[model samples]
Target chain A: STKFSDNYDVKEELGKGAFSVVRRCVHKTTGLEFAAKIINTKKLSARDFQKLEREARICRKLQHPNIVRLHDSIQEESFHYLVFDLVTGGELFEDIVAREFYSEADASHCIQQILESIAYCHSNGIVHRNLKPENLLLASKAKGAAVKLADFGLAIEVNDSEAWHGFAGTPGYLSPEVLKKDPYSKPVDIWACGVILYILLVGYPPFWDEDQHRLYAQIKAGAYDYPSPEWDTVTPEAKSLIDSMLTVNPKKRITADQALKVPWICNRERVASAIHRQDTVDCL
Target chain B: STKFSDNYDVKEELGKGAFSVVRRCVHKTTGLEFAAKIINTKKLSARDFQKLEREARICRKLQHPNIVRLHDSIQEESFHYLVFDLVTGGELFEDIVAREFYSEADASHCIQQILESIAYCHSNGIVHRNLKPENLLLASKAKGAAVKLADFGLAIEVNDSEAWHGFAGTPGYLSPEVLKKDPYSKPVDIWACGVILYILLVGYPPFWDEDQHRLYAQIKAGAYDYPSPEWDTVTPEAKSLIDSMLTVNPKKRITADQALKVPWICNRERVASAIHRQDTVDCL
Candidate 1:
């Protein structure tokens, strides 16, 4: 029904990107609401249409707990009509700071949940080049609503050299390899997600090196400072999980699934953010 | 335009409706595919002779990114074929917001186009009573494509003083006044725009609840807020604009012209690309 909406009524615009604009629509008879992507037919020369198809092809083929679904398509005047669901959620980019303070969880359950989705993608040979707070969304208003890893913007590595412009993820989340322009793969997501876990627990990003010329060097060295003040409370298992995910070498990087199996991520009772642990920051 | 002028050879019976038979038709010249609603002449019904005003509205060199192009309305004696020569693309309502990483800028451009088009309609004394995005279409698969409005099915008489209906537009996008059963005018469109804008900014509708009664109450009482933890960074300027439009008092709500004048609406790469695009086709 989403694919064909002559029977549907479009309600409002939902979200927009240079690649596409989405709006809400409802079926006239059923009254169900969903969002659709507006791809302009005219702006696309015969050649660019291939680009549109290739990207949509990836979205259409994907389905997982954390991935968004591409539901339908319609060829119309203005010729924009690929549609997807309207997610009820919040972005990590906005959520972390909004929490007002740092938070912690399963020395790894939260990271595990995030990894599950990306794990599915990796199994299918998909790699999301950019991962940041903006890249994650938690649907539903309730707490711990499931996170859906989205924005396929850099998904297919349509990383045109100029593609970096569309790379809107926070600079704080860029992995050492990504920043250094090294050949890479799925581990890139693992690193970003790891840093994400750090920020979520620390109440701030792991790094802030805009003016620092040695920033990439630090990232490549897999180095970052944890205040003994804050680390005095964090758990050892949690620190190890971060260590594994933030590895400098892609080949040496820990697999998301492997991290999920670790006691920190697997043990629900463990509060990785628990203070008073009296642990000192050694390697992490 | 289809190279062939007169006949669309029907290849398959897509489906049969109460009074209409839906068929897949393809033009010989261009291979334009269309699902035509074919009603037997004996079953054909509905019309108004606002021919002059309609023509004036159509011929006024009206240009905007969201309005759907009403292609030739073919009035063959046996069947009423709304022959939109161009095929389709997709719907954005249910699709775009489904992404995990949606930005405030994404939602803004979609509104930017809506305000421009609806503003054009209001200025001409034309009210798109059913102005929901569901009634709109994208030109193609390109995000930069224009949006075109379709469906005058529940639209007001282009030049009527009291062209009222019981209720128009989708339930979620309906304004409070309309829900209160208040006799309303152009402002209803504004309120609906607000709802649409709210959805664009937030992934879900502001007044939405599973229960229709609950939803109507929320909208009626003018109750809504930016959900917590994120949306903090959404510029005060963006929130300020949404606030002015979401005003419960329809009397005081911002006008479309007023919205168009806002700097946020005026300056954006989203709308700028929309302006340069040609063919504005919509899919049903």
Candidate 2:
């Protein structure tokens, strides 16, 4: 009587992956539609299920507008069901790609939301471990839709500063400390956010590579530059903010809360360039 | 470069359905997590695709804290990908079921969030058509987490008053106007909210029956009561608010914006009973 199907009328498929699939479903009693993730338990190991449980547990503790909200999780014999808000706005880049006009104000607004979420997590002693453009989602296609932070698989709630040891996070955005295999904490998230901000202002990544080894070397050396054209138009304040976040020393790296106060992010419209970056759009 | 996998590392499954699956994904560059809804295009008809597209179009225009935010939409040869915030909090009832105590203050807080969302939508000329407990999601398991509204499949944007004709929404939550085959508008959402509030206070639906016909009859007649034990603990002001919303005439029904001003909802903490509703939890 309490079966998922009993209360909800599963509709069309929303997405799929190797281990799970997402579908649009409507509550039979309320006619409200939702996105449901049905995962096959048979495909998972005991350790994998523990990780899944941890994800749910950590996410359950975080409550923020910029963070993706998990609505429901149901366990069955062979499958697990998790329901989430069906967001249809598109990725941060997707919106940027489709935009005819882009500005520092727009970029700053996006970063502010990201930092707010990061700050919230950090204050709560949780480290997202990953912060990037792809994980940044525009909540809607609406004019002022928020840029939401998503994906918490690598997120960790810290009790000890030396707790995180293994390599985690996507390349390019990984902090130098992470690459050195050093003990890291919340600063790593700030570094990744710095990488994202760099990309936001300039279309291409600060660290690029055809070879993973070279990429790692560049990240470790902190070798990057604001070449002539793209960096020329962006405000000094913007670059300054990025520099604070991307500091090679994790100790000196700016916190998400502190970064929000920077003029480039806080007084975005006043200090940020209003000029459109067709160059960035073309690069994307 | 544009492929979904290039930007994100799809991980374990979050959910599944007949035509879609949802998986947790991390941004390769930043390590941020997200939920991906991978829908098989081959399983959908052209009309179904159009509905999906329409859903995206409408949702793009809405940006509200209480509403589920759509992050990204992507299309591939055989699949359509939608990425959303990986919310981990269970459904609204799931929280209520687990709660050791619930109060009129708690219920009012829930309804206030719903009304705020509905008010925003109605102001924007959009009607939700369905509002129920199932569609309501707690943003997190954290204390003071906001409740969110989900399921936009049946939502319609109005250009004309007579545009809606056919039946919509869950049975009991459906309005008297809907049951009478009369044209309806935003008032229907208010009625559903009333049904939800009634359930919130008393732990059972105000209108219930074994037969679908009888259920419809009760809904049409606006037949319901706040019976002895459950009703005894609830404040008169709370019942008064529900009465305003559940009024049979669509013209006379309290609008979402108007209802927000009611003292019971506006001054909930002071006016509502602090007494715990263990009875409600047991009923659930």
Candidate 3:
């Protein structure tokens, strides 16, 4: 009842976290694989341990196709093991650079899953403060496998205390409200989705500079552009969708549900070109 | 004088450590690229800060072709910055998997550099508690670029204190003595190098099991094999070198200096094979 290894056979390492190491493992009876996020409880303080518990609780609450599911949770003497789906599909854009065909429709299909996931989270009153490409993982290498939204480390319940509001998230993905030190809610995630979509079509970050301060300045000012030739190939419908999401005011930004209904996302095949974007590959 | 960003311009991230983030940076005046290992001193305890200082001190002591050089160090109020060579070639075996050419000679050449670096460390009375493929980095993408041994996080000066002896290193690469909880020194590094060599020639680890405890038992027994077809093509000279390092008794195991002089490492091109081992590629 206390040990994790008793039922599951441990395998190779997947990755690491601050106080945990993720490893691939298999169930003894059914032979199903999972990513075991094994945290050394000895290394965590009481507060941090509670946070870990909160993460597991939040993950268990989210059970959508795009969201990675929590299969099991075990609290051992010195270690806390949380088993999740073994996502071997690799990170977002890894296959895009390798594959021959990468079009606007392909980008739309990926974004639709992300929006649907976010919509689900928002409906559950959960705010995923961090929503960069690193958290967006492909479920598998198989065709039509979902772009699974993983990593709930920074996600918080909307009803939680305001004390949780602080500088959280990657520099590139930080919303304008977050950069301005303003109280941000669900719209912040929508803003990050806009950044992801921009990079999905183009090959680089919309808000970036060698100087991080300048990068933050750009983000806070909502200063980003579609430079000539690269944007020329991109459809105006997609640009309109981006404009709505990247609005300077968080209140003006489209909700995940609202964005999902946009022509570029709802009817991606009809609106988005099937042309293989060579420039995307070239830039990547 | 007090800031790191004063002289150098920071670029993209390289990787992360427990308390630090390594980023690709450029020297402003000279335009030379460097890896900026910016550590958060605020996160470190007084004892841990001293340990970090010792790591920097130990890193500065050894300078060799196969070792990453400590170019500069800067201490700021909340952070400590360490600048190193910008190694862009990627980790060991990354290129071997991608490139067409693979042979015993290629593996030997790589191991020689690692041994040379470790020998230098041993000569200086330093013990690299951890020595694995993850720490062995390629200096550049250019052909024939040196495999630079990086990350001195667990390295300790032998003359410092006897109290420092403890359990350390990766499970697969851990020496028998280390696994047995016996006091281990420089020869432990040799054992890890042997593990690395076995993987370099072949694809998978010499001692790996789905069950980690069972894998530990194998390590403690020093039980590993040169199994069929994969080991068939590897020279006896290479196998002999691995055997000496993987000796169960730490006292009998070869030291870094002794391993350096082994015929397989010294006369690599002459004694080792030139023919590509297709199985190595297949296994990888």
Candidate 4:
């Protein structure tokens, strides 16, 4: 029989969401710390179950330090427990905001790490459908010092013949082709990276919205503009990288490997310092 | 005496910041993997030393898988070496770009983990003054599957004052109070989290900027308008979460504990689905 302790000596509630509670726990015997994600399996549908399994399988195959690690998955009578490595560091979003802005060097360092991971995933023929700041985790050891990608529930493996289609991802970060509801290839990831890079340097996405249609239209038409204040200090190489990644045509979007070779990624100093000044102009 | 390797075997350059360069390295003899953060101490002043010490202390107290682990700090004649656990995974921003956009469910899972880490920091009386996508890292152990917070270069321990001056944090994500140079507290981190949450769900910061003064004014005025199209489908609870976290007044800003208590954070179904969706969005 499984024992559900109301007070499993919960060190701290890791997080709470619509359907479950995740807590950091210390195994009584092993004295090992684990992040326990407790979900009521009964509330899910068959599709949801499939999704869960897919996530678990994907996580199992992924072995990287920047990404979250899954230790074990167990099923009890009423709930499913997804035990993960406990990461105590806070969010990267907070770190960026507190620093006010990062230099091109900083952006390059981050982009390089991102590219290395993506390259690795693409090589394995896996496509991460959703990527955003929240999905990323910082290692507690580094204390917002090192970045890792997390959450593989939505990933799909692609072969030579298959293509991905769905209205997935956050609006602002979506590729132009994805926003258009067009069939997309792996390169779409590069487009999304472009959006993220733009935001990282400028402090906002090129195309943004609360409304889906309007957001889509902006993304599809490529109707966004980069502010001079933000871009003025950015280098041509950096801008060029953004352009290559964010091209409306998925066919033309830069590949992750190609992106790594971009001047901005290769030369870290110029762009890194451009955005480092905290006293720069502010936009509310 | 620390035995410095004659040849620093550079596995890969992890990242570069304003005053430093981080690299994945190994000592030939020990064959131990380590992250080497090389900093030019010439730029650091007495005040900076205090800041560095404070950051190191904060890191010393935090223990989590998602956060980077600090191994040792070595001071050379002209440089400072921050030796850390070598995380192979990449940045979350890259993963997000690769996936494009994350589903609300996926965003929540990532957010929950981040919250857990932040909650731990807050519990320990530490204020991560800086938070953003760039600072978040994925563990190499799981191929960008694990999330952790890194970079404590700007963190400060909180006290009764609850607020500090000098205007830290990225533009567009900073709270109105902080932007206006007002005295602020730990909740400032919450406000930044709110902005990050918005970006996670929507892919852009609520406030934008082309000009510093104009952006600052807008932030000061708390002029944020959510677009209906993109956000219409977003759950009311998620919106409420954002609203509560982004509140201009630090006093009213939702505490980490309160955030965990919110429905969006507590519900099991929502949490599971979110984690599942994250896999797809992260792949874009």
Candidate 5:
């Protein structure tokens, strides 16, 4: 009874994409849990199936604490089952939305872990083009559980000297190069990390607007500011770190290795306190 | 300019006690921040200063992430500032009061951290006599900042076989044995942790009354319930764990180690989501 399909073990639905649905599946015997990534492959083209194959292939190669683990996978003509560690801790951004205490120290630990994971990925020639809050999961309901990077379907395998060109990644998290269709590199993920750090510390994203064009323009310009009150107390070191990563020119952008060496990340305590006023945090 | 008074420059006032005051101090040139716990030694008895010394000495040995760090101490004729990590995230209890979106996952993490800190203290032969919401500080203003154990001025050092006789701790967090003027030990701290977890999830303490007699009676009885609707979704595991800790009998009460092994703490993902149905968390 260790089978996931038997004993009518269908669980709650996680998310739905164009060709796949992620569900929770509990094994009958030990009641062991897994994220059952149900992929509908019947009418899915060889192209889409290749995408899934590349995802599974890429995930199997990377091993890092912050990256999600791929437990087992079943490839068939009708259905492709990719079982994963069931991370019940909710979406990263939403989880913090109602939280009473969110601080710069928390953000430092978060981004630090993320950079380590990305460094591992970059060294292994993997690029997580879609690095957003939605794709991150907490390891447990326990406080400060390691943030696990999820959703590898959009991830790509890349190499040095390869100028990747594609219309890819979620708009909100996309780097300027991605929007401009410029051939990008590992720093794309670093840009997204900067955005996540900003959102985590500031309680909002850097670029915001109703129009997609304006949003893209803001990102392309890469002239984002630390606006009043929210950015008032943010340490010069933190701002400097973000600046190092958020450069519009990907060639000049800070990579994972370079980021770890940054003053704020290297000596986190060297950074100033009062990153944001207490009143500003409570208001969020 | 960086000194805490005239000779010691002040940055931010942390708290004002009856006779002691806690301020934030930053080292000049290097710029290191410390929670400058300033006690006026002039009027203070040698006993209170020893208490402060004992607290600092006790904290130095407890090095868990959930426990606050006591860096160094300076004692002069007029003032005593025990410099340590400055936590700005506010009291652990008050931080959650305003958040309507806090889920059971958040509470699970919160309690686990507290238990871990308590476990560390007990293992080190120290008992935090005064365990309360106000005594727990968030390490920073981040979403997943560490829930730091603070305010060890009233703490006691005890051996394994000792059942010390004393009336200590905040009224709301006092154990039944302490309230009844009976001998108590590490379990008293465990009981206080239960009260803390109870308030963290339930949005209220199990025992409350304007009348001192009624409050003491409530503590002695140790009978509390997960009221309907509010606690409907709070997993039975959570209730059971709390019940075990809230046991009136010190012999039967869950120890910090035992509490950490509870299902709610051991397997946090087992519980259903959203333990708070209370309206108090929202509308901040």
Candidate 6:
């Protein structure tokens, strides 16, 4: 049996959160580098554990250009080791924060990659419950300017039995049905995507709140303020796509396929400009 | 700075797939256990890495009883690690295989959970791109099961700039849009969930194909053979739910929230009986 190395040549701490820690490492033999995630399993119950398995299973089924790849996992006596691609381009959230706003063309390009990856997943029967800037990453220089969808811990293959019940996802990006704790459909992701687009274009989410309740209330009411300045810079096609994506009625939300056909999304000029900008950026 | 152990003490191999391996482990000092997924980054590209990151971010955001928890991620020289909760129960696929067949009520319960989870995901601005029997898992026990939605690698939060594209997902279970390479919506998952429900109740999917081309044709046509024998005991509500979920028009597919309110799903006795029969060893 192949055994894992005794020590990861620790380089730097990339980031840390409540449930896990991320670190950079280099292989002793090949001198290759990667990222690792360590999870505390004791905090999760048997049910939660099963959920983790599902995430692994889903990851196994997907193969896409704009999605994160799983490298290898090792289990030491005390902790579980999850190895991942060490993405140097950094988080899309950082880009959003830096740009203070994105042009319609830029947002469209990023959104296109996200949609392409998502479409691939849907075709394969996987669902990503969380969509946010923090989860997306820019590809390395060799790969060109592209966005990838990452994380599969909450991913589940759609089945008849587990479609509804509890809630999941980031607060600002949550759809109305999720806020209401009602059974929702896949359109929720579309809604979140709409929020992301808004953020990319305006440098802030449509629903902003220091208070959780108020934020949720605004979300449910679809209370978003689109300033004329932001709207003026955004194309009508982009606005139309957002209209379809952000519809309060889940049924009314535009499908992924339909969104691609929207004039702005399909416009050759926009697509070219977006790709050009992506090629020049050192980091997304 | 905390340092990751040099070697992971693998407790057991949780699962094996075409591209990755999953194992269980515990932290020595904290006495915490976690499921670790090891991926071979050498086989992937920059785009693939992005997808992985997206999955990790989404999974990290999901917090539901029926969903798996992403504890942490660690990267080492040789592998990528996704640390998660370790589940004890075996695969739900095994349960289906062992039972040979599940009753309508039993299928309803499972379907209900799937719907609930999907609904939760949708409400949270997420869409499960994939839904199938193999992806669903029982939380602990088979009957009166607590089903959790797993996998978020392929999932994406929707936005206005892009539409669903590319061809992903298993054959036979995919929706028309997926087959046609048309942009899709969250309804695609619902359509797949309908197929899974059919399989759970009948022991086989409605659209079966030994050949990929034929399968695509069948899926596009929405062809199915619902034997009268199966329906003799099937409830009308169940049938209705199936009808709605399987609608060809992506826009018309039933949302999880709406499906939950259907009589078949809401009625306790019908759902309970299905579960009882499904959990029973006796053959119908």
The candidates, ranked best first by lDDT, are: 3, 2, 5, 6, 4, 1
How accurate locally, in lDDT, is each candidate? 0.64, 0.78, 0.80, 0.71, 0.76, 0.72
For candidate 5, lDDT tens digit of each residue in B1-284? 22344344568787888677778887765677777777777877788767777888887777655777887666665777777777889987678677632467778778877887788788888888888888898877776677888878788888877575567778888899988788788899888888877787768888889998888898999867778888898878778888888989998888988876665664423113211121111110
Model 6: per-residue Cα lDDT over B1-284, one tens digit each: 12335434668888986557998888776788878888776776788889888988898887655666787777766567888766665556777888887877678767877887787787777777877766676655534546667777677786533376567776767898788777876777899889988878867778887888898888887777678786678767677778888787777778888897776775444111110100111110
Better of 4 and 6 by lDDT: 6
TM-scores for every predicted model: 0.44, 0.48, 0.47, 0.46, 0.48, 0.46
The CAPRI quality class of candidate 2 comes to incorrect
Which candidate should be chosen as best, given DockQ against the real structure?
4
Could you tell me the lDDT of residue B212 within candidate 3?
88
lDDT tens readout by residue for model 2, A213-281: 546766887866675555678888888888898899898889998998887777634444577666544
- In candidate 5, stretches whose alpha carbon ends up further than 4 angstroms from where it belongs are A1-284, B1-10, B100-102, B268-284
Task: Score candidate 2 by DockQ.
Answer: 0.01
**Tens-digit lDDT string for candidate 4 (B31-96):** 888888887888988877876777777787888776777877777777877778777677665665
lDDT of 3 by residue, A151-266 (tens): 78788788533333777877777888877887878888999899888877765557654335445766887867775555778999988898888987988899999999988888
What C-alpha lDDT, on a 0 to 100 scale, does residue A18 get in candidate 2? 65
Lowest summed lDDT window (length 10), candidate 3 chain A? A93-102
Interface root mean square deviation per prediction? 23.3, 25.6, 20.3, 16.1, 19.5, 21.6
Q: Candidate 6: global Cα-lDDT?
A: 0.72
Candidate 6 docking class: incorrect
| TM-score winner, 4 or 5 | 5
Note the chain A TM-score of all models in turn: 0.80, 0.88, 0.88, 0.83, 0.83, 0.81
The sequence of per-residue lDDT tens digits that candidate 5 reaches over residues A1-284 is: 23335532768998787778989888677687888888887878987877788888888777777888887777655777888777877768667566622587778888888888889899998888888777788888887788888767777777796485576777767888877777777888999898888777766667653335445766887846675555778888888888887888988888899898876776746345437556545655
* Predicted complex 1: DockQ: 0.01
Model 2 regions lying over 4 Å from their true place: A1-284, B160-162, B268-284
- Over the stretch A165-202, how does candidate 6's per-residue lDDT look in tens digits? 35777777888987787777667778878988877776
In model 3, pairs of residues that clash are none
